[PDB]
């Protein structure tokens, strides 16, 4: 049993991602049984947009020699690893968008033979940030795993020899003004807290959580993903040191009876047009659908603006009845708001249909209805061109 | 619950369709209560084929230059938008099939500059025509109305800028020899007529008609898009004009339970089919199979000749046992007559097989045989080479 | 803890319209649905239709033409007023919080009820 | 769609007693069932708030038991305070509404 739909409360800044970010959502809810005392409390938690993870913006630099001869004409290029100093002040020149830059790069010139040295640097690249460890894990880093790249050296390395990866800030410092102030009511079994009801008023079930902290202040790092401000019990364990890699949890799926009907069928579902969605490289706005949380935890919305992937992080909400999202012709209200459409195409493969209609690729299939334009197909560009062959 | 098996009763001349003219198939018959009084009676409809819609033959004009220099040797192509009296003319003389308009075009000989300029006419193209309003709708033109080609302008717009089209008459004429007779029994309950009998013997329900003029002869358009000739409530009104459009239909959905298992649950394997269409822009004799209408409304055949998706209209029947459909060895029995087979190639992916043998996905599939005939891919070119980009 | 009294006229002479309130004492409007349930005298009970703390709106299909809700978050107080007044409108009324299955975990069902008030029609 | 429950239930003290509600797909097949008691003269109770959870101080006599397409609610033990009219309410999704079926009076004999 589920939900007919669920909306995003509030939305974070979009950013940039490829297929191979995809990932299915978790359709699991926790519910604790004997909680019967409520009471009101307060509690600090992460902003939207920095839950999932911190990013530092970066770049790449791959030199790459322009070699020609010169009335003979014949153009050579060879790749290699260039050195930190001059990629930083290449990257300095080109952000200073000067033309210098520019010709320096795409007009080699090379006119018995002549040679031209150049250093080409890729647009910026994110990676997240480990706060445990201080390390940077991305898919451009060999391994997954570039560690104290701040500690130590400046670059760090790329699966492509003769590339390397650079913050874009000399070293990582990271803003801590990613709090905000919630107000709640606390679940108490007994003595001990259970959980707690969040602002949004969803249950939020404090069973297995591990004990974190970040920017110095201590905290508990949910079962969800959230992380919430709150008293520990001292018995809690520490976090262990592992994060943001493959999924590696254990109690939930032993203890909750992962329903076959509720949980492995609708996995099953989801991972078939994500497999579809690898093979073909090619995305359409109803397999978008297909990677949408059914349920009010915490997740990621998908939309494709300019060609390009787009992902953010969001608080889903259950929706009743098809009124409350599309109240008149032409809104979609989000958080209240009728939310503004970019080249008429919202979230989750929500789309301005011709007639100048919100189309819900889940409420028209509910009619019987049926529209070209969700099915048609785009395929979108890889994110790292260099980096990764 | 529906029946094992569908065929066409009579089918009507073949034209040939691209992979965006398919549609999934409706699979609601309506069926009403309390008439319970039957009386024979004689009633006039639209033949087969033309149900659908009248369908005028048409031609496009795109014009490009032939431009070369000359001892130098370079080729120059660049694009306009050419008149209407010269589209015509070159248009006669390509019916003319003379070899003069052949050079005119295929060889453009620019021999210092020197220019040909060369108009160039795509094959026949068709285009819908509204009753109501006379007016045209294709993809190729503009946001899909042209209206008013022959009162105003002999062309119309496309998309692209360069391109124009032509109707193959000069004037929108249209014969009106269209109609068929057949008998039948009406279905009466108190004085009102709720439905009439056919000539197939399938029960045709008259809620939900609107009244429309085909020919100067008043009828109703049916809730399945069928036209009959028969007596009409003066309190019916008059058929909404717009016609040839995305789905806008309503009381059904509301009256009718979707029945999310009957109905819903088909409607999204079929979507599932097509959207793999979409995506791979080829077909398979086994996906072919999964379009077409599980119960006996008139509907839409589909096959594939010469590389060619094809498209026919039809009236289908249900069948209980496989023998009547398949007699003996060879013979696939449509209207009491053995179907012939171009290329042994039947309709809805019926194909013959290496044995002689008339095989049907999904009574072989019933049977748990497998064949590796029906699975082949085979890409489908795209109807419009330039109109459409 | 949340209790809720329902408020109003006991009797109405036809074609004129109900009043009736009821109040929300010790817990806050937000994130519950609240609806209106009635009951013919010895019969079963029917959903008049609810409303949010938004403000959307729902009704039964078969009241929906004679049927208005409103609330007022201000004062802690929904009401419901019916356009038309007939003898088959006698009933008992109930006040209820409609917690929705999927809407938040903790809470599941319509959890608590007022006490049932009488309108007659005269 | 609509709720269809038995018109009236009677048994002998000391004795396990069932009322079943039999509904659509989109009733009982897609959404949870709730059963409520009302004494005469008073406003009725949620006796489950789940479609086999019980919420606090409802004796554990009582247990409901939900099928595909329809649903139940057994009482091992019959007391002399048991005679009441149960009700059972589901959401319809086509519909958009609250269902309330038919309620069953249960008489001690």
């Known amino acids: 049993k589920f939900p007919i739909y669920t909306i995003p409360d509030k939305l974070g800044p979009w950013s940039p991602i490829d297929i191979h970010h995809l990932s299915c959502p978790n359709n699991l809810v926790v519910e604790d049984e004997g909680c019967t005392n409520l009471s009101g409390f307060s509690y600090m938690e992460l902003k939207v947009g920095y839950i999932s993870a911190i990013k530092m913006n970066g770049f790449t630099c791959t030199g790459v020699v322009t070699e020609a001869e010169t009335v003979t004409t014949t153009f050579k290029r060879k790749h290699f690893r260039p050195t930190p100093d001059a990629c930083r002040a290449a990257y300095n020149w080109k952000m200073a968008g000067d033309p210098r830059y520019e010709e320096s790069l795409h007009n080699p010139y090379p006119d018995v033979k002549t040679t031209k040295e150049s250093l080409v640097i890729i647009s910026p690249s994110v990676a997240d940030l480990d706060p445990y460890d201080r390390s940077l894990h991305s898919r451009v880093f060999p391994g997954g795993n570039c560690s104290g790249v701040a500690v130590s050296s400046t670059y760090c390395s790329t699966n492509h020899d003769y590339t390397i990866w650079m913050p874009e800030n000399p070293r990582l410092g990271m803003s801590c003004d990613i709090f905000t102030n919630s107000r709640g009511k606390r679940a108490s079994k007994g003595s001990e807290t259970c959980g707690f009801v969040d602002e949004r008023g969803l249950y939020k079930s404090l069973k297995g959580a591990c004990k974190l902290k970040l920017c110095g202040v201590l905290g508990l790092r949910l079962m969800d993903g959230t992380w919430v401000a709150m008293q520990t019990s001292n018995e809690t364990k520490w976090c262990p040191p592992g994060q943001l890699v493959n999924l590696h949890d254990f109690r939930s799926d032993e203890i909750e009876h992962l329903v076959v009907e509720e949980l492995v069928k609708k996995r099953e579902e989801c991972l078939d047009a994500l497999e579809s969605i690898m093979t073909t490289k090619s995305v359409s706005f109803r397999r978008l659908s297909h990677l949408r949380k059914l349920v009010p935890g915490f997740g990621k919305a998908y939309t494709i603006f300019n060609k390009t992937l787009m992902e953010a992080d969001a608080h889903y909400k259950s929706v009743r009845t098809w009124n409350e999202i599309i109240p008149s012709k032409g809104c979609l209200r989000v958080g209240g708001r009728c939310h503004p459409h970019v080249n008429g195409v919202f979230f989750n493969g929500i789309i301005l249909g011709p007639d100048g209609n919100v189309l819900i690729p889940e409420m028209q299939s509910s009619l019987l209805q049926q529209h070209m334009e969700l099915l048609v197909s785009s395929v979108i560009p890889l994110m790292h061109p260099l980096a990764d062959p | 619950k529906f029946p094992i098996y569908t065929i066409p009763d009579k089918l009507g001349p073949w034209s040939p369709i691209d992979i965006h003219h398919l549609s999934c198939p409706n699979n609601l018959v309506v069926e009403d209560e309390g008439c319970t009084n039957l009386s024979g009676f004689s009633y006039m409809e639209l033949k087969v084929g033309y149900i659908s819609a009248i369908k005028m033959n048409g031609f496009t004009c795109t014009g490009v230059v032939t431009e070369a220099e000359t001892v130098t040797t370079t080729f120059k192509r660049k694009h306009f938008r050419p008149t209407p009296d010269a589209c015509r003319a070159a248009y006669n003389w390509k019916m003319a099939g003379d070899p003069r308009y052949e050079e005119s075009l295929h060889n453009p000989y620019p021999d210092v500059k020197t220019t040909k300029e060369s108009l160039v006419i795509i094959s026949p193209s068709v285009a819908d025509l509204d009753p109501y309003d006379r007016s045209l709708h294709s993809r190729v033109f503009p946001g899909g109305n042209c209206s008013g080609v022959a009162v105003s302008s002999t062309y119309c717009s496309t998309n692209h800028d360069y391109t124009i089209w032509m109707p193959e008459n000069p004037r929108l004429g249209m014969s009106c020899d269209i109609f068929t007779n057949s008998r039948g029994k009406r279905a009466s309950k108190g004085s009102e007529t709720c439905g009439f009998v056919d000539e197939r013997g399938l029960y045709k329900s008259l809620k939900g008609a609107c009244k429309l003029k085909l020919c100067g002869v008043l009828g109703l358009r049916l809730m399945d898009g069928t036209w009959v000739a028969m007596q009409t409530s003066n309190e019916t009104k008059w058929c909404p004009p717009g016609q040839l459009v995305n789905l806008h239909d309503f009381r059904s959905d509301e009256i009718e339970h979707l029945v999310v298992e009957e109905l819903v649950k088909k409607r999204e394997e079929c979507l599932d089919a097509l959207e793999s269409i979409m995506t791979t822009k080829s077909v398979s004799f086994r996906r072919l199979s999964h379009l077409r209408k599980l119960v006996p409304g008139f509907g839409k055949a589909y096959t594939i000749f010469n590389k060619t998706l094809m498209e026919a209209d039809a009236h289908y029947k249900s069948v209980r046992t496989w023998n009547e459909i398949i007699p003996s060895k060879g013979c696939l029995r449509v209207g009491g007559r053995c179907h012939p087979h171009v290329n042994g190639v039947f309709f809805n992916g019926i194909i013959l097989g290496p044995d002689g043998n008339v095989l049907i996905p999904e009574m072989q599939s019933s049977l748990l045989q497998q064949h590796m005939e029906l699975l082949v891919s085979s890409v489908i070119p795209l109807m419009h080479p330039l109109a459409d980009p | 803890q949340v209790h809720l009294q329902e408020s109003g006229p006991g009797l109405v002479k036809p074609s004129e319209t109900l009043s009736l309130t009821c109040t929300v004492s010790g817990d806050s409007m937000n994130n519950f649905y609240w609806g209106w349930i009635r009951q013919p005298a010895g019969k079963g009970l029917e959903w008049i239709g609810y409303i949010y703390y938004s403000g959307t709106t729902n009704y039964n299909p078969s009241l929906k033409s004679r049927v208005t809700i409103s609330i007022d978050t201000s004062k802690n107080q929904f009401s419901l007023k019916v356009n038309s007044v007939t003898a088959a409108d006698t009933a008992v009324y109930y006040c209820a919080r409609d917690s929705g299955d999927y809407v938040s975990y903790y809470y599941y069902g319509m959890d608590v009820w007022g006490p049932g008030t009488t309108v007659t029609v005269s | 769609s609509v709720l269809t429950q038995s018109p009236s239930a009677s048994d002998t003290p000391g004795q396990r007693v069932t009322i079943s509600c039999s509904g659509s797909?989109?009733?009982?097949?897609?959404?949870?069932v709730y059963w409520y008691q009302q004494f005469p003269g008073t406003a009725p109770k949620l006796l489950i708030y789940?479609?086999?959870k019980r919420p606090s101080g409802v004796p554990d006599r009582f247990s409901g038991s939900t099928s595909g397409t329809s649903a139940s609610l057994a009482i091992s033990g019959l007391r002399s305070e048991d005679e009441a009219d149960y009700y059972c309410?589901?959401?319809?999704?086509?519909?958009?509404?609250?269902?309330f079926g038919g309620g069953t009076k249960l008489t001690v004999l």
């Open positions: 789940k479609s086999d």
């Open positions: 309410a589901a959401w319809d999704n086509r519909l958009s509404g609250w269902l």
């Open positions: 797909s989109s009733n009982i097949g897609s959404n949870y």
